Amino acid sequence: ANAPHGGVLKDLLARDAPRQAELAAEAESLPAVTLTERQLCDLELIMNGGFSPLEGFMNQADYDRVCEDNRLADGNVFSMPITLDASQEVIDEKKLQAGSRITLRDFRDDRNLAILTIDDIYRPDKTKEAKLVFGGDPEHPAIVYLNNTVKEFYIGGKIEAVNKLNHYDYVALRYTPAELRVHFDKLGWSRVVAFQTRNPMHRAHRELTVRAARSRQANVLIHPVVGLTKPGDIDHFTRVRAYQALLPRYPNGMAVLGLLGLAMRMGGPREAIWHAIIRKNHGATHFIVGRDHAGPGSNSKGEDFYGPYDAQHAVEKYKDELGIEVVEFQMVTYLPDTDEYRPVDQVPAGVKTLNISGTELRRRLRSGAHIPEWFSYPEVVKILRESNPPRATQGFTIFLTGYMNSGKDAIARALQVTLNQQGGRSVSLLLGDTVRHELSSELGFTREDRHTNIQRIAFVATELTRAGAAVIAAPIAPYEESRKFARDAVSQAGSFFLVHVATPLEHCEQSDKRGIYAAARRGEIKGFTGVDDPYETPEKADLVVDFSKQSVRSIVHEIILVLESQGFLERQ
Amino acid sequence: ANAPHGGVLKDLLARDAPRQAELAAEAESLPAVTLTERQLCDLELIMNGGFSPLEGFMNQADYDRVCEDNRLADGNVFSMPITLDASQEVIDEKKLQAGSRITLRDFRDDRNLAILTIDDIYRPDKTKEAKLVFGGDPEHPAIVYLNNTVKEFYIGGKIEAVNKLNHYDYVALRYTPAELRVHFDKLGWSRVVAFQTRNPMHRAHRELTVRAARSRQANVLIHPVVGLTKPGDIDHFTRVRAYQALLPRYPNGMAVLGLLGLAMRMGGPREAIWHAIIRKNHGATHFIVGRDHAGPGSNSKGEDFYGPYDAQHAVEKYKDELGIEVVEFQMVTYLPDTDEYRPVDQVPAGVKTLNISGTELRRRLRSGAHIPEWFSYPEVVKILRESNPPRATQGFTIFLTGYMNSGKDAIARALQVTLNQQGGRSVSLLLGDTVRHELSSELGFTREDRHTNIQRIAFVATELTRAGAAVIAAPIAPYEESRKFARDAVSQAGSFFLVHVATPLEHCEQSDKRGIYAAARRGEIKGFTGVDDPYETPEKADLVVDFSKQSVRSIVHEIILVLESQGFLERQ
Ligand SMILES: Nc1ncnc2c1ncn2[C@@H]1O[C@H](COP(=O)(O)OS(=O)(=O)O)[C@@H](O)[C@H]1O
Ligand SMILES: Nc1ncnc2c1ncn2[C@@H]1O[C@H](COP(=O)(O)OS(=O)(=O)O)[C@@H](O)[C@H]1O
């Protein structure tokens, strides 16, 4: 191990252990504030010493010296603002003011975690934070969070610990700075290189780590983030399973896997200084920083937020103040002819190098294509495939919208039979009327009530899509707002296709065998779509059909052809 | 977890941690006694609380109450004598007497471990121990140890801790009662069934453990012995590797593997009470006792030392005093027709049951034959095969003995060429003269010097055999004593074959082209085998040949045929 940053490990949970009962009791009495997931990651690392010397959510004095000088008021280096935000309504409703004692509660199990004592309650310049800490790009994940999720005020204050967060996943692999230190001891280690990561580890990474181990004569701590990462990365359960598949590739007893409940910001260079501090608090003697450490890639105009290696420079600016040795690496690649990996600054400008990008990997994962062993070990690839299956087995939703009696309900049942013939997956059919009877029996037909209904279809459709089913829904869905809502939700889990059954109102009305359009026409049914209520025509549907000009059979054939072109009907 | 036996966990290492430096210094000054491997297992468990309430090697008061009442003088149950034996010569040479302070040293790295303060120094009745503790059979492993390894006197006394033993194998899987308890906590466990074992775990055992887990609503602690076990079991590195291959067969986070540095005695029933105590000290809430727990099978006259289930009765006699719940099991077997396992007391006397015995398993391992998956998981079997390979790849030693110039040296070189033709393994040729030049250049030809020489051949032959080589040695080897020594050593690692080149002395002498027999005959070489020194004719060799009647070629053919009949020349 190594000494904590600042000299004292701020293990608030060990400090306040003797007062637990009392603190608990006192916590039942104060006004409680319930934490967001990101504040819960921060609170966990504060309470266990991970953010030493910090020992509570930053007050303005501390905050400002970081927002601009990468230091805490006490002078210690610290590059990342760690604050507890709240809205004016909560500040008032709870009567929060300096010197107040609030309880911080776990939204997951309602437990009282800590008691914070307010120093101040300031309103920060979200623009200067945006710009001074996370570069300035509005597309940057941290900045987007800063504006859309972070409330208006920051409540600074020291923390006293009531309970350690509960976690039900991987408890034996989670460690507090104190526990990890005791472990390095139990193992008899003295020099430990820590490896940060928010992705599955491939061949190249196994090499960085063994290289660092060999060069610094150190043991390896694979220390992945399991809290919050970049917006769309592979879930942590898949990643942990992947890190575990990799362990057997190191010589017996050389590496140890320990999980870090950090909530990354993707602050590139700053986040890198921050990471070094954290690993030092956890007891690592060395820490790897490679290409694009903690970087979130590039923005929409294709410009990338930080340059490669900038984070290595930043962590370098404080070589003398960060009490942990950084081990640098340049992009590592594969040399086919020699069958080896090395940093680019070691390949003779004439030698052949291979590399599979993020995009190429997703392409192969999606298509079922082979992924080279020089790239990633077999057991790892297997795990990745189990989580990101090919289109051949992914679920999807076919969303149908059109006037009542436009043929959308017959098209839906035929598509269902057709896909059951096709065979790949379980097919769930949600006909407008079925949804109305089974899920929305009590809603009405007001714009708000219809919107609610379509949201209900989307909630169900998303869970079925996530389980790999083929969901077929055919409600009227008059408003573009509900439809886009539907599409956004399902898209979180898989493909969503909007098929607009644009059969003309006259046709629909003239063939209604249930005299519903009739009753509407004689005012027995108020606000009926097409007669009273509107029908916002879909602007950019994936497919437009007409039961006036095409038959159920060929409309079905057209939908099938779309699923086919995108690989959903391939063989599993 | 659960409370220690006696109420206080005797963690001598945690107790004396604050005095470490002082104790260390004082330990450099007292007369030190170096521990045997079994005393080192006992010392480790004493110092870490595993044997709580015990806190040193038993003095007579404690000893006697166990030798006969299964209790320590303080009344607590304790069925196994734990003592530190010494010989009169050490007791005198060191001047040990009551009130003396000796240092206990680790023979492995010379470290000073503990300081013992002598209460007494008594001479125990090895016959009453033999009989009252380990039944009475002279073939029993404990008893054989008691008489052949245990010295004459037992030195009783409390212990103070200087250093915890060092171990270089599996440090992350080794646990002290304190560490395991902290771990059960970290994992959030409360009820824990511990499983004792000194063998690889097969399908049947995975079932006992899941059954106990399900019935007592408990988590599983696979707690194998890694100290000293029954005389010929599978080495602990192979077993640990096997337990690790098994873990993935339990549902995620249900079992934990922790190693126990116990030195078993194979005391059946008593050892079982003992084990319950130990597991309780380690914090387990329940402990499994099955068929023949801690039993060492049967003696030579085929009578088995303890009956099945006797140990379950014994641990039952103290149900009220052992503060840990025993979970009993009757022989568990495989029901082919249903493909399931259950205790025999659940198979309808008409149902079909399958079982592979220890012998059948060794038979298959030795022959390369398939081992059913209903019996043992695939990954486990693989590991067992890597450690106990078929005769096809085992090493072996061909030991040749006969008069100087009997043809033994030509037979040896031809056998070498022949086996190199054959191909399976690396062949090491140790011709008498080569051994004499390379290993024994300075020995003479006195009975003692020859014996030393043959021991040197055996040391080298054993290591090569262990590495799977074919060793061919052809020294004269005049004395049966040396030859039996040779055979015993190699037999520890693989097969040893004695080929007696019984070519008659006249023939040998008459064809000596080096005039050595000549110089012996004219007294220029004193004590020459056959002329002066004797040649103890081999009584039970594996093969007897004569260069007078057979040719090198067919003698070689006869040896090859023997290796073949035993499976060494099969294909790998
Ligand atoms: N091919 C590579 N060559 C060198 N360093 C790399 C390579 N891939 C990743 N790294 C570095 O290894 C760690 C792996 O990072 P990732 O999990 O991809 O994302 S990050 O946000 O944690 O940096 C970071 O230190 C990163 O800079
Ligand atoms: N005011 C109404 N407008 C349209 N359909 C109605 C109305 N009142 C009842 N219905 C009936 O309810 C179903 C329409 O339900 P949905 O498709 O669920 O409509 S949506 O607006 O929420 O998309 C059809 O059976 C239709 O005949």
Ligand SMILES: Nc1ncnc2c1ncn2[C@@H]1O[C@H](COP(=O)(O)OS(=O)(=O)O)[C@@H](O)[C@H]1O
């Ligand atoms: N087939 C079996 N059925 C029931 N109990 C068994 C079986 N095999 C072993 N056991 C029990 O499980 C543990 C395994 O013991 P072994 O490693 O074979 O040897 S022992 O010396 O530790 O008992 C002991 O409790 C033993 O009694």
Ligand SMILES: Nc1ncnc2c1ncn2[C@@H]1O[C@H](COP(=O)(O)OS(=O)(=O)O)[C@@H](O)[C@H]1O
């Ligand atoms: N006194 C002796 N008896 C037998 N062989 C001898 C003697 N002195 C020298 N030699 C030579 O040493 C070799 C005998 O050595 P070994 O086979 O090593 O004998 S053994 O007694 O130790 O088995 C042969 O070369 C032999 O000619």
